[PDB]
Ligand binder design. Structure first.
Ligand SMILES: O=C1N[C@H](c2c(CNCCCCCCNCc3[nH]c4ccccc4c3[C@H]3NC(=O)c4ccc(O)cc43)[nH]c3ccccc23)c2cc(O)ccc21
Ligand SMILES: Nc1nc2c(ncn2[C@@H]2O[C@H](COP(=O)(O)OP(=O)(O)CP(=O)(O)O)[C@@H](O)[C@H]2O)c(=O)[nH]1
Ligand SMILES: Nc1nc2c(ncn2[C@@H]2O[C@H](COP(=O)(O)OP(=O)(O)CP(=O)(O)O)[C@@H](O)[C@H]2O)c(=O)[nH]1
Ligand SMILES: [Mg+2]
Ligand SMILES: [Mg+2]
Lengths: 169, 167
């Protein structure tokens, strides 16, 4: 009936990790840029008729983290790997997050969703096709999101829960 | 690429148009403008599949239901919408469900029960009562808000998944 899920939101500086989480939890867009150290949020949601208690870890994008990172990558059940569609460097950084999660988990089969955030902006530098091809090579879903409009936000989190559910079964 | 014909039904002022406009245009319509009949196309990716949604936004008023049996036969899936602060709109769900089943000549019709206006603290219809009704119908129940966009994609995507299973 009731199941807890530990979700981890990872990605480079300013991709919108906090804004995506705050949209899901508080139903509003944060226009401010306030760097995260580490925050966690709970949310009880119904996904495919099942009562899920989400425990979401919102991580720091700030580079030079071999600190606290391995522990949450070990504890986390599923990962949202976020890049911003107008930030090519954040997309190139996905390889590093994916590889480190796989290394810490000691598995090639880790519940994960590739998230292309800021899809409300007409300043795209990363094509949907290139990100779709990367997710296909990883064997993971790819979802374009906007923390501003809330487009794809529920889809990204719910898809990740569905991926965790499949892994356990 | 797959086309999906979706029909949004429900009583007067439940937010059928606002839910659709939020999905198609990513904005909330504050104004109340009664619908006669409108349709919208939207290309979306659902579970890796490119879907072309053809959404029919219907009238909540009886006066504009001349196409009702025809769109209930043509429609592949139905969003049956009530407003959580309108008990009469929840009681009206029985009529929409029964007419869809009658026109389709089947008890197995892709359908999602939608409890809209969940952003309002003026609820008159409990989540449990609506969950129990959806359970008795054997259909999913999703609470939505066209204002915040909470549950909107979940409601439309769930309906596409229900159609996909039926097919
Ligand atoms: O399933 C049920 N849960 C309910 C329940 C609760 C309430 N729980 C509320 C969550 C509170 C988490 C708050 C810290 N959670 C913070 C958090 N969220 C994360 C998400 C991903 C990864 C790590 C974390 C972490 C951190 N935890 C780590 O180990 C860690 C490592 C490195 C890091 O850097 C960060 C972290 N308490 C219970 C005690 C006994 C039995 C049941 C329960 C319950 C009641 C019930 O009637 C029936 C069923 C249930
Ligand atoms: N237009 C637009 N802006 C966004 C979106 N998501 C986040 N932003 C903006 O980007 C900036 C950074 O967002 P934030 O959510 O703090 O990113 P972050 O990845 O958590 C930053 P850190 O890694 O230091 O914790 C903010 O000004 C925020 O308003 C989006 O989907 N669209
Ligand atoms: N607070 C809140 N208001 C809503 C929501 N959805 C619709 N409304 C409001 O309800 C009113 C009617 O919405 P509308 O989308 O026209 O409803 P409708 O069911 O299409 C009306 P008709 O049946 O005549 O076509 C509008 O004022 C609109 O702003 C919601 O989720 N939350
Ligand atoms: Mg942050
Ligand atoms: Mg209308």
């Amino acid at each position: 009936g009731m199941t807890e899920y530990k979700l981890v939101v990872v990605g480079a500086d300013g991709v919108g990790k906090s804004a995506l989480t705050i949209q899901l939890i508080q139903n509003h867009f944060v226009d401010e840029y306030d760097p995260t150290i580490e925050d966690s949020y709970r949310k009880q949601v119904v996904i495919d008729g099942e009562t899920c208690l989400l425990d979401i870890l919102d991580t720091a994008g700030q580079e030079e983290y071999s600190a606290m990172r391995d522990q949450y990558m070990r504890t986390g059940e599923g990962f949202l790997c976020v890049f911003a569609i107008n930030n090519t460097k954040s997309f190139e950084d996905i390889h590093h997050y994916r590889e480190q999660i796989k290394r810490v988990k000691d598995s090639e089969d880790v519940p994960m969703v590739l998230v292309g955030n800021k899809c409300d902006l007409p300043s795209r530098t990363v094509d949907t096709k290139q990100a779709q091809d990367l997710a296909r090579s990883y064997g993971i879903p790819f979802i374009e999101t906007s923390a501003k409009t809330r487009q794809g936000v529920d889809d990204a989190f719910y898809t990740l829960v569905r991926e965790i559910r499949k892994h356990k079964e």
